[PDB]
Design an enzyme around this catalytic site. Structure first.
Site, PDB file in Angstrom:
ATOM      1  N   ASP A  88       6.426  26.010  -4.207  1.00  0.00           N
ATOM      2  CA  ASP A  88       6.775  26.028  -2.560  1.00  0.00           C
ATOM      3  C   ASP A  88       9.302  26.447  -2.330  1.00  0.00           C
ATOM      4  O   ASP A  88       9.179  25.019  -3.899  1.00  0.00           O
ATOM      5  CB  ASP A  88       6.059  24.774  -2.134  1.00  0.00           C
ATOM      6  CG  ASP A  88       6.865  24.467  -1.148  1.00  0.00           C
ATOM      7  OD1 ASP A  88       7.469  25.474  -0.210  1.00  0.00           O
ATOM      8  OD2 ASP A  88       7.230  23.530  -0.765  1.00  0.00           O
ATOM      9  N   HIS A 135      14.364  28.790  -4.847  1.00  0.00           N
ATOM     10  CA  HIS A 135      15.409  29.020  -5.124  1.00  0.00           C
ATOM     11  C   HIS A 135      16.379  28.279  -3.878  1.00  0.00           C
ATOM     12  O   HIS A 135      17.276  28.378  -4.679  1.00  0.00           O
ATOM     13  CB  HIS A 135      16.231  30.472  -3.443  1.00  0.00           C
ATOM     14  CG  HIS A 135      14.934  30.011  -2.114  1.00  0.00           C
ATOM     15  ND1 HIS A 135      15.601  29.741  -1.198  1.00  0.00           N
ATOM     16  CD2 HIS A 135      13.659  29.865  -2.094  1.00  0.00           C
ATOM     17  CE1 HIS A 135      15.127  29.753  -0.179  1.00  0.00           C
ATOM     18  NE2 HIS A 135      13.412  29.899  -0.958  1.00  0.00           N
ATOM     19  N   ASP A 138       1.416  30.417   6.783  1.00  0.00           N
ATOM     20  CA  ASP A 138       2.650  30.386   7.660  1.00  0.00           C
ATOM     21  C   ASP A 138       3.118  31.458   8.248  1.00  0.00           C
ATOM     22  O   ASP A 138       4.419  31.782   8.700  1.00  0.00           O
ATOM     23  CB  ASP A 138       4.252  30.060   6.357  1.00  0.00           C
ATOM     24  CG  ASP A 138       3.671  28.467   5.763  1.00  0.00           C
ATOM     25  OD1 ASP A 138       3.892  27.467   6.388  1.00  0.00           O
ATOM     26  OD2 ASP A 138       4.776  28.731   3.881  1.00  0.00           O
TER      27      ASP A 138
HETATM   28  O1  LIG Z   1       6.957  11.877  10.861  1.00  0.00           O
HETATM   29  C1  LIG Z   1       6.534  12.100  12.025  1.00  0.00           C
HETATM   30  C2  LIG Z   1       7.514  13.397  12.255  1.00  0.00           C
HETATM   31  O2  LIG Z   1       7.970  14.682  13.132  1.00  0.00           O
HETATM   32  C3  LIG Z   1       8.805  14.838  13.395  1.00  0.00           C
HETATM   33  O3  LIG Z   1       8.514  16.399  13.010  1.00  0.00           O
HETATM   34  C4  LIG Z   1       7.824  17.423  12.265  1.00  0.00           C
HETATM   35  C5  LIG Z   1       8.931  18.440  12.305  1.00  0.00           C
HETATM   36  O4  LIG Z   1       9.397  18.145  13.738  1.00  0.00           O
HETATM   37  C6  LIG Z   1       7.914  20.151  12.263  1.00  0.00           C
HETATM   38  O5  LIG Z   1       9.357  21.097  12.231  1.00  0.00           O
HETATM   39  C7  LIG Z   1       7.135  19.573  11.611  1.00  0.00           C
HETATM   40  O6  LIG Z   1       7.651  20.436  10.244  1.00  0.00           O
HETATM   41  C8  LIG Z   1       6.388  21.031   9.461  1.00  0.00           C
HETATM   42  C9  LIG Z   1       6.561  22.452   9.119  1.00  0.00           C
HETATM   43  O7  LIG Z   1       6.670  23.240  10.829  1.00  0.00           O
HETATM   44  C10 LIG Z   1       5.583  23.659   8.380  1.00  0.00           C
HETATM   45  O8  LIG Z   1       5.836  24.603   8.261  1.00  0.00           O
HETATM   46  C11 LIG Z   1       5.374  22.868   6.707  1.00  0.00           C
HETATM   47  O9  LIG Z   1       6.952  23.636   6.227  1.00  0.00           O
HETATM   48  C12 LIG Z   1       6.906  23.560   4.564  1.00  0.00           C
HETATM   49  C13 LIG Z   1       6.354  24.956   4.395  1.00  0.00           C
HETATM   50  O10 LIG Z   1       5.179  25.598   4.370  1.00  0.00           O
HETATM   51  C14 LIG Z   1       7.081  25.024   2.557  1.00  0.00           C
HETATM   52  O11 LIG Z   1       7.152  26.651   2.035  1.00  0.00           O
HETATM   53  C15 LIG Z   1       8.285  24.259   2.409  1.00  0.00           C
HETATM   54  O12 LIG Z   1       9.351  25.351   2.763  1.00  0.00           O
HETATM   55  O13 LIG Z   1       8.330  23.167   2.705  1.00  0.00           O
HETATM   56  C16 LIG Z   1       8.192  22.264   4.440  1.00  0.00           C
HETATM   57  C17 LIG Z   1       7.387  21.071   3.642  1.00  0.00           C
HETATM   58  O14 LIG Z   1       8.613  20.541   4.520  1.00  0.00           O
HETATM   59  O15 LIG Z   1       5.908  20.809   6.548  1.00  0.00           O
HETATM   60  C18 LIG Z   1       6.561  21.180   7.192  1.00  0.00           C
HETATM   61  C19 LIG Z   1       6.679  19.277   7.537  1.00  0.00           C
HETATM   62  O16 LIG Z   1       5.347  19.079   7.800  1.00  0.00           O
HETATM   63  O17 LIG Z   1       6.067  18.641  11.159  1.00  0.00           O
HETATM   64  C20 LIG Z   1       7.510  17.730  11.280  1.00  0.00           C
HETATM   65  C21 LIG Z   1       6.392  16.765  11.097  1.00  0.00           C
HETATM   66  O18 LIG Z   1       5.142  15.659  12.183  1.00  0.00           O
HETATM   67  C22 LIG Z   1       9.596  14.864  13.917  1.00  0.00           C
HETATM   68  O19 LIG Z   1      10.899  15.226  13.785  1.00  0.00           O
HETATM   69  C23 LIG Z   1      10.384  13.684  12.410  1.00  0.00           C
HETATM   70  O20 LIG Z   1      11.431  12.904  12.961  1.00  0.00           O
HETATM   71  C24 LIG Z   1       9.236  12.366  12.096  1.00  0.00           C
HETATM   72  O21 LIG Z   1       9.040  11.799  11.349  1.00  0.00           O
END
Ligand SMILES: OC[C@H]1O[C@H](O[C@H]2[C@H](O)[C@@H](O)[C@@H](O[C@H]3[C@H](O)[C@@H](O)[C@@H](O[C@H]4[C@H](O)[C@@H](O)[C@@H](O)O[C@@H]4CO)O[C@@H]3CO)O[C@@H]2CO)[C@H](O)[C@@H](O)[C@@H]1O
Ligand SMILES: OC[C@H]1O[C@H](O[C@H]2[C@H](O)[C@@H](O)[C@@H](O[C@H]3[C@H](O)[C@@H](O)[C@@H](O[C@H]4[C@H](O)[C@@H](O)[C@@H](O[C@H]5[C@H](O)[C@@H](O)[C@@H](O)O[C@@H]5CO)O[C@@H]4CO)O[C@@H]3CO)O[C@@H]2CO)[C@H](O)[C@@H](O)[C@@H]1O
Ligand SMILES: OC[C@H]1O[C@H](O[C@H]2[C@H](O)[C@@H](O)[C@@H](O[C@H]3[C@H](O)[C@@H](O)[C@@H](O[C@H]4[C@H](O)[C@@H](O)[C@@H](O[C@H]5[C@H](O)[C@@H](O)[C@@H](O)O[C@@H]5CO)O[C@@H]4CO)O[C@@H]3CO)O[C@@H]2CO)[C@H](O)[C@@H](O)[C@@H]1O
Ligand SMILES: OC[C@H]1O[C@H](O[C@H]2[C@H](O)[C@@H](O)[C@@H](O[C@H]3[C@H](O)[C@@H](O)[C@@H](O)O[C@@H]3CO)O[C@@H]2CO)[C@H](O)[C@@H](O)[C@@H]1O
Length: 1526
Positions: A533, A536, A668
């Site tokens: 993941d 970079h 994704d």
């Molecule tokens: O505790 C509850 C929290 O709720 C809210 O958080 C949300 C964000 O607003 C969303 O954007 C989402 O984030 C996802 C993301 O969309 C998803 O693509 C995935 O990303 C991975 C990715 O696959 C990987 O390649 C690399 O980039 O790592 C990422 C992991 O971070 O996962 C993201 C995280 O789950 O969901 C979150 C969580 O519900 C609110 O903003 C928070 O403040 C609140 O605490």
């Protein structure tokens, strides 16, 4: 069996690329281990380093690397290991690094400067890929098929998972990527991990329970397994964060953030009490959101006080000035700019009177003045008494100081506002993503940027949680104090998860680095590999250390990256250092059809008919290298990395770009349903599958799921609905690729062609060894965009076979279930009506599509090119050795070289050299000609080259190559070579037009190498085992020595005769010059082992003698010309050289020849009884010279007048040489004459220089007398051993001198007559005129010539004397002269023929010039500043000899406590031969030029290969060899 490859280093210890494959990485072949052997039984591979000989990097040279020495020694990336480099000046060193286990490995060189300090090269990495294997089944890295599965949509038993496993298994995926299966966080994201040490409780109790599950997949379905590993973050709710809050970025670790933390606490403080103020609960208009915006500015910007974080508190600073006024006395210095320079001064105060950390970010008010140092400045500058407006003047300065600090704060806070405009208006209003949930406990305006909690240690903390930044350089930790992204609000935030502060190393976060070690280990021992993941954004050093850990636990770890750094350049660096095996690519990212035809063409493979690498003329052919006599070494079970040919140079190790893993669709990615149409799910997936690369797909893609599945919010299981959507079609694509898996190994092997036409993409996927193709027509559904008719597809010399056709069609919409995720309804209907048409006379296949072929469709044909089988490959690579087996060093000329006129000479006018259309002719008719052109071509895969074109435009070159040899068919072993080339050429012509460039290159390249290895084998060892540069020089012999029709050296036969240079001196009455042969003889014939040849030349010229000297031009000894004084002496010197070098060569002396001219200097009876009339031992021919000179020579050139010479004046023709018995030296010639090698007889009319030579060199020529000295010395030493039998010389009166006296005569008189001392006072002893002088420290070029000053000119000839007879020279005197030459006469590849300071230094040879310039017209110049190359050979030999006597630091204590040269001197010798190494690499001919123009500029009239230019540099090598090499 054979598992080595060869990594050439350069002079600077940099690796050398064999082919341009573009921006790459040194990855070693992905083969399996040889039959039976398990890991550590043996080296997996062995990288041979090859360090060039005499390179700077070999001076106290050393190779450091971290490949462990043995299979037991673990790798540690920091531990290095030494290997001494063996210096030779002749002999390139080679060092094997054995690799026992896969991973990533560097090496650098340490060595010594020309400052004698100790320098290092950079590190140079290279990778060894894992052996992926499932049972007894090797999975090459291009036959991976990876199906990403999300753990939490597989239902709650490990049983219900085994079904999901079964479904992928039937589509013949061999690798499943799990998204992490650890205890999930609070948000329930699989990327938000609660505990990296524990596996998800819902499913697994222990790690055993997951390891056993993975081991099922292995044995049950033939499936290997990756995990996502997550380095950058843990989950907000982890209760090791309570226990170790240091692991993240907080007040203590990352204090710069203290401003950003306060901003964040004061934004979720706002949305709470915002309710009680203004109307921004839920909004829908840009001009009632600007209502919230000003609500922000008041209650949060305003309420944190003009930002004391950037700026000095002037009111505080000033009033603490009033209290501590009168304390740091004054300031004594002059360093204050006057009050007028409002700015310059304020900058001065900033630097001199501020507390450390000024211009930082950090604390609430931490940008401070040193009050006391300030006071001082003010006291000195203005007034001691505060009350003379210091309070004023202090505020002014303080404010000016705050001017950039305030513009810093303003730039920052505008970018805060705009970042909050544009993420409240995205989060709470539809733009692209409406999500209008108003406020909550859990839905404020501000994303939580920091996670907030009380630790076990009792205190409050606030760790920065992680995200990403729109347009940011991803390599720059944004939580680091380099970036203000958390304060500027530039972060797109996963509030879900907390950022992990690794350090510089484990010291800064040691608990963290241990968990991540415990974590990485645990997964590594279960899984076959990892998916990293967001690589970079993981600092290299972190990635490196943790992958190393894993790869210790599991040597065959497979690592796959999602990695877009800035450049390809960077992505290579990351792959290098981390040992990434595979980079991930996404087809779903293609916007249009063309955007996809392009992605597909990146991950296709190489062009069809791409050039193939062979070693050509930039390699050393060791005489002792292995041979694989009929290419039968490599045994299929041994998995041997193979050499190109019979001759066993190893497979080069060059940069190839990093391995790709193409995802038809990731987890994704918005689905083809979303971004295109479900129907594209097919052709898109086939296109990808048709790439030569690994491939994969997320679950559901094949199953035709409708919406991309949201990783967080999703609830349900995957449907059990078997064989949905594309299943049948992947099974086919995957099983198809498996059949291909075995065959193609290396980059050069799988070629391809891609074509986009409207909505059609056309992917030809060839194999380049054997001819099997697959052809794919994919008609895409980017949009429903109507009716399009692809045109009749045409293949060439190819056959086609329908394999399959399909159309994916939409049956309707997706079902809707609360607890199960299902596909769109889809037919997959098979198609027909594809009309395959082979024309038996064109050999063309035409393919017509039926009109029933709806967008969303495929047809796969299998293909087979006509003329290629498995057989071909081997047949081309074999028997070239046995053909050349009968070659001699004569006959090698005919196969390889032959300038065009040399070839008109054999063919009586009709043959010559092949004119490549739009290029011109090569230079040799023989193979060198082609190799000179092909090399850059193979390197750049230039299929566009005019040669490339003509080579498929037809087969004429193919046949020219084989038909030339008709001319030289009888010459030894040529016949057999030609027949090898016919058989291979014949066979090649049975290939599609478009493959004949590739194969003709290889067929030539092979026979050229064989031919050249055959040359080194027949030449001496000193050549046989040396560097390229030298063999290259050596081969130049074989250019020059060949038999002719129009000429020879014996007059009744035509035999091997040595040309002066190609092509101006190769033919008729112009090939052989006595001067040129005998200056060359040592270098080209003796140094190289061609003793038998040398003999034939010496004896052939012996015959010719008359006027007691040897002729200039020799018409094979019949009507030669004796306008040459030089020659006799250069001759006799070769006779010495021979007796010296040839074993038992003394016996030359007794060899009789037919003298073919009488004993008085009688007229020319060409073919009387008076020609083969009487004989002469070489013994009595040497004598014959000395004696005739002693007693005076005097003669009118036999057959004078316009006829024999068109320009010689009447006066000149008759010539004299007479020995001045006062000094013992040979004076001769006249002012209308050129007995020396500096022999331009001026010819121009308009400049008025006819019959008036430009360099008469009459009287005592330096070289001549040096040569005479050598000769006397030698015959004396020979008198001493019975072999010479003379002390006798009659003088022109009758009186008689001991040869021994003559020797003692010169030995005292020479240096006297020729030296010009540095000190004006010593002049007495040395015979001169002051006003007729130029420089001093010279040995003059002439003594008592026709014109006064032409004696005193600095010129490169004396070096000849210094080499042949250094006894004449007082060391210190010579070493000063030869050093001036080095700074004055020495050009970059040749020796200036005259001192640049001189009035008639005109250094541009233009032999065409018809001007009125007495100097430049019709090349009078030739010997007046033009830089000749044989002259460098004498110069450099001499320069070495006398720097080795004279200079202390040019010497060192050698073998046997006797002296040998130091590295310092070699370094200086090597440097003065770089421009010769380069000249010969980049000549179209092998060799060095005759002659260069001012400072290296190419002289268009110069013969571009001269004999003596390389013969004299060979001499130097031979000296260093014979002198010091045991
Ligand atoms: O505790 C509850 C929290 O709720 C809210 O958080 C949300 C964000 O607003 C969303 O954007 C989402 O984030 C996802 C993301 O969309 C998803 O693509 C995935 O990303 C991975 C990715 O696959 C990987 O390649 C690399 O980039 O790592 C990422 C992991 O971070 O996962 C993201 C995280 O789950 O969901 C979150 C969580 O519900 C609110 O903003 C928070 O403040 C609140 O605490
Ligand atoms: O000022 C910075 C930024 O803020 C405002 O833009 C907002 C966007 O308008 C908004 O749509 C939001 O982006 C969404 C996006 O709509 C959605 O598609 C998805 O984002 C995609 C990106 O669209 C895509 O480019 C890609 O990004 C790559 C990136 O190009 C690459 O170089 C590397 O850095 O990796 C990135 C991906 O990891 O993929 C992402 C999804 O991963 O989700 C986004 C978030 O919801 O972003 C802004 C509001 O948050 C400003 O108006 C604008 O000037 C700037 O774009
Ligand atoms: O049948 C036999 C033969 O006899 C006669 O030959 C004589 C020449 O015609 C006559 O001129 C004389 O040759 C001398 C010449 O005078 C003298 O200058 C020198 O020749 C130099 C060139 O001057 C010099 O420029 C250089 O020329 C190169 C040139 O660099 C290159 O760019 C290209 O143009 O090719 C030229 C070489 O072909 O080098 C040469 C030689 O080093 O020395 C000559 C002899 O020592 O004497 C000849 C004696 O046979 C008839 O005239 C001739 O027609 C008959 O075929
Ligand atoms: O104008 C052509 C010129 O050429 C001839 O003189 C030569 C000198 O004898 C020769 O030494 C050289 O002169 C150098 C001086 O000797 C030296 O002391 C210093 O001053 O540099 C001078 C640079 O040339 O130059 C020419 C040969 O090129 C000829 O004899 C003259 O009559 C004639 O005028």
């Amino acid at each position: 069996a054979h598992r080595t490859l060869l990594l050439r280093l350069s002079d600077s210890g940099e690796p050398v690329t064999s082919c341009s494959y573009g921006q790459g990485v040194l990855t070693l072949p992905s083969l399996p281990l040889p039959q039976g052997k398990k890991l550590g039984d043996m080296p997996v591979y062995t990288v041979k380093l090859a360090i060039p000989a005499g390179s700077p990097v070999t001076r106290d040279g050393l190779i450091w690397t971290n490949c462990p020495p043995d299979f037991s020694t673990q790798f540690d990336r920091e531990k290095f290991y030494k290997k001494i480099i063996k210096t030779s000046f002749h002999e390139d060193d080679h060092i094997d690094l054995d690799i026992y286990v896969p991973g990533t490995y560097c090496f650098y060189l340490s060595f010594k400067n020309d400052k004698d300090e100790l320098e290092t090269t950079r590190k140079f990495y290279f990778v060894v890929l894992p052996i992926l294997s499932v049972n007894d089944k090797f999975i090459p890295l291009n036959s991976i098929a990876m199906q990403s599965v999300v753990s939490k949509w597989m239902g709650p038993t490990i049983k219900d998972w085994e079904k999901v496993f079964a479904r992928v298994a039937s589509k013949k995926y061999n690798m499943i990527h799990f998204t992490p299966l650890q205890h999930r966080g609070e948000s329930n994201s699989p990327y938000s991990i609660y505990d990296q040490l524990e596996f998800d409780p819902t499913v697994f109790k222990s790690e055993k329970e997951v390891a056993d599950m993975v081991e099922r997949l292995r044995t049950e379905h033939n499936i290997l397994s990756l995990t996502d590993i997550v380095f950058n973050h843990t989950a907000n709710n982890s209760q090791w964060l309570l226990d170790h809050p240091e692991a993240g970025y907080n007040h203590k670790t990352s204090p710069h953030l203290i401003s950003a933390i306060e901003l964040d606490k004061k934004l979720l403080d706002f949305s709470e009490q915002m309710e009680a103020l203004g109307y921004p609960v839920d909004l829908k208009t840009v001009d009632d959101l600007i209502k919230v915006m000003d609500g922000i500015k008041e209650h949060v910007i305003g309420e944190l006080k003009l930002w004391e974080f950037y700026v000095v508190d002037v009111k505080q600073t000033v009033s603490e000035l009033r209290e501590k006024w009168g304390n740091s006395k004054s300031w004594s210095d002059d360093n204050i700019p006057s009050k007028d320079d409002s700015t310059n001064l304020a900058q001065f105060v900033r630097d001199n009177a501020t507390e450390p950390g000024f211009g930082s970010l950090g604390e609430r008010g931490s940008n401070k003045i040193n009050i006391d140092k300030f006071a001082a400045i003010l006291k000195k500058l203005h007034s001691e008494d505060y009350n003379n407006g210091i309070e004023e003047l202090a505020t002014k300065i303080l404010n000016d100081i705050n001017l950039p600090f305030y513009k810093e704060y303003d730039d920052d806070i505008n970018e805060v506002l705009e970042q909050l405009f544009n993420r409240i208006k995205y989060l709470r209003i539809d733009d692209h993503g409406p999500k209008q949930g108003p406020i909550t406990k859990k839905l404020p305006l501000s994303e939580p940027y920091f996670t907030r909690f009380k630790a076990k240690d009792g205190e409050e903390y606030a760790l920065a949680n992680n995200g990403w930044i729109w347009d940011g350089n991803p390599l720059v930790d944004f939580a680091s104090s380099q970036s203000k992204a958390y304060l500027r609000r530039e972060v797109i935030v996963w509030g879900d998860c907390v950022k992990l502060r690794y350090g510089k190393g484990p010291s800064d976060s040691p608990y963290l680095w241990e968990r991540m070690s415990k974590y990485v280990e645990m997964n590594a021992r279960i899984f076959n590999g990892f998916r990293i993941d967001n690589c970079h954004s993981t600092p290299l050093h972190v990635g490196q250390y943790f992958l190393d850990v894993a790869r210790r636990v599991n040597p065959n770890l497979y690592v796959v990256a999602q990695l877009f750094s800035g450049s390809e350049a960077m992505d290579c660096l990351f792959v290098e250092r981390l040992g990434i095996s595979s980079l991930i690519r996404e087809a779903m990212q293609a916007w249009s059809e063309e955007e996809l035809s392009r992605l597909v063409h990146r991950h296709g493979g190489r062009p069809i008919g791409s050039y193939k690498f062979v070693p050509l003329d930039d390699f050393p052919y060791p005489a002792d290298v292995k041979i694989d006599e009929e290419y039968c070494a490599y045994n299929p079970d041994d998995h041997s990395v193979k050499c190109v040919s019979e001759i066993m140079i190893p497979k080069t190790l060059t940069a190839t770009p990093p391995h790709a893993l193409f995802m038809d669709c990731t987890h994704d990615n918005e689905t083809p349903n979303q971004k295109r149409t479900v129907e594209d799910t097919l052709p898109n997936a086939a296109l990808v599958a048709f790439c030569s690369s690994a491939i994969g797909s997320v679950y559901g893609y094949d199953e035709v799921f409708p919406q991309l599945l949201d990783l967080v919010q999703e609830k349900r299981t995957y449907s059990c609905a078997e064989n949905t959507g594309i299943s049948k079609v992947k099974t086919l694509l995957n099983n198809m690729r498996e059949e291909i898996a075995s065959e193609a190994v290396d980059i050069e092997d799988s070629e391809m062609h891609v074509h986009h036409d409207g909505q059609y993409i056309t992917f030809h996927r060839t194999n380049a060894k054997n001819g099997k193709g697959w052809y794919l027509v994919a008609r895409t559904k980017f949009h429903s965009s109507g009716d399009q008719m692809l045109p009749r597809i045409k293949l060439s010399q190819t056959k086609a076979t329908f394999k399959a056709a399909f159309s994916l069609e939409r049956t309707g919409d997706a079902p809707i279930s609360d607890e199960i995720i299902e596909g769109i309804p889809t037919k997959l209907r098979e198609l027909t009506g594809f009309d395959i048409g082979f024309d038996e006379n064109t050999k063309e296949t035409s393919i017509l599509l039926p009109q029933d072929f709806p967008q969303g469709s495929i047809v796969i044909f299998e293909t087979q090119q006509l003329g290629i089988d498995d057989s071909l490959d081997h047949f081309i690579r074999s028997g070239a050795i046995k053909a050349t087996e009968k070659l001699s060093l004569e006959s090698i000329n005919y196969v390889l070289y032959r300038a065009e006129q040399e070839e008109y000479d054999y063919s009586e006018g009709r043959s010559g050299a092949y004119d490549i259309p739009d290029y011109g002719k090569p230079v040799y008719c023989g193979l060198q000609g082609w190799v000179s052109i092909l090399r850059k071509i193979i390197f750049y895969n230039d299929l566009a080259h005019p040669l490339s074109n003509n080579l498929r435009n037809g087969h004429w070159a193919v046949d020219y190559v084989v038909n030339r040899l008709d001319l030289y068919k009888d010459k030894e072993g040529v016949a057999e070579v030609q027949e090898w080339l016919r058989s291979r050429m014949e066979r090649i012509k049975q290939l599609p037009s478009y493959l004949v460039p590739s194969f003709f290159a290889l067929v030539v390249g092979i026979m050229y190498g064989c031919c050249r290895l055959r040359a080194m084998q027949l030449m001496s060892d000193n050549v046989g085992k040396s560097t390229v540069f030298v063999q290259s020089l050596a081969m130049t012999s074989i250019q020059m020595v060949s038999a002719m029709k129009s000429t020879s050296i014996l007059p009744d036969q035509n035999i091997a005769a040595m040309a002066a240079g190609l092509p101006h001196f190769s033919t008729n009455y112009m090939r052989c010059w006595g001067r040129d042969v005998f200056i060359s003889l040592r270098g080209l014939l003796l140094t190289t082992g061609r003793y038998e040849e040398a003999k034939e030349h010496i004896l052939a010229f012996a015959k010719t003698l008359k006027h007691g000297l040897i002729p200039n031009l020799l018409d094979a000894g019949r009507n030669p010309r004796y306008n040459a004084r030089d020659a006799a002496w250069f001759f006799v010197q070769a006779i010495q050289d021979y007796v010296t070098i040839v074993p038992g060569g003394v016996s030359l002396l007794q060899e009789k020849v037919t003298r073919r001219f009488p004993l008085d200097d009688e007229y020319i009876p060409y073919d009387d009884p008076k020609a083969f009339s009487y004989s002469s031992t070489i013994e009595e021919i040497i004598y014959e010279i000395l004696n005739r000179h002693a007693g005076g020579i005097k003669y009118r050139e036999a057959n004078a007048g316009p006829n024999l010479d068109r320009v010689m004046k009447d006066e000149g023709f008759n010539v004299e040489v007479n020995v001045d018995w006062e000094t013992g030296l040979i004076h001769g010639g006249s002012q209308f004459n050129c007995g020396t090698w500096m022999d331009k007889m001026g010819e121009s009319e308009k400049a008025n220089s006819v019959g008036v030579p430009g360099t008469p060199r009459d009287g005592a020529a330096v070289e001549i007398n040096g040569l005479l000295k050598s000769c006397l010395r030698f015959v004396l030493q020979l008198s001493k051993d019975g072999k010479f039998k003379y002390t006798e010389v009659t003088k022109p009166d009758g009186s008689k001198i001991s040869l021994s006296s003559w020797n003692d005569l010169l030995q005292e008189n020479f240096e006297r007559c020729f030296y010009v001392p540095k000190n004006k006072e010593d002049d007495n002893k040395f015979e001169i005129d002051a006003t007729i002088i130029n420089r001093r420290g010279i040995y003059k070029d002439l003594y008592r010539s026709g014109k006064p000053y032409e004696d005193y000119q600095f010129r490169p000839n004396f070096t000849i004397a210094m080499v042949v007879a250094p006894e004449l020279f007082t060391p210190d005197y010579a070493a000063g002269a030869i050093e001036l030459a080095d700074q004055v006469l020495r050009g970059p590849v040749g020796m200036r023929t005259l001192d640049p300071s001189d009035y008639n230094y005109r250094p541009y040879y233009n032999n065409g010039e018809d001007s009125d310039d007495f100097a430049t017209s019709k090349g009078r110049n030739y010997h007046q500043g033009p830089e000749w190359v044989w002259c460098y050979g004498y110069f450099i030999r001499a320069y070495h000899y006398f720097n080795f006597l004279t200079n202390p630091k040019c010497q060192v204590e050698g073998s046997a406590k006797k002296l040998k040269p130091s590295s310092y001197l070699y370094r200086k010798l090597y440097s003065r031969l770089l421009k010769h190494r380069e000249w010969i690499e980049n000549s179209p001919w092998a060799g060095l030029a005759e002659l260069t123009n001012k400072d290296g500029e190419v002289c268009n009239d110069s013969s571009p290969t001269q004999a003596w230019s390389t013969g004299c540099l060979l001499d130097l090598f031979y000296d260093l060899w014979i002198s010091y090499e045991e």
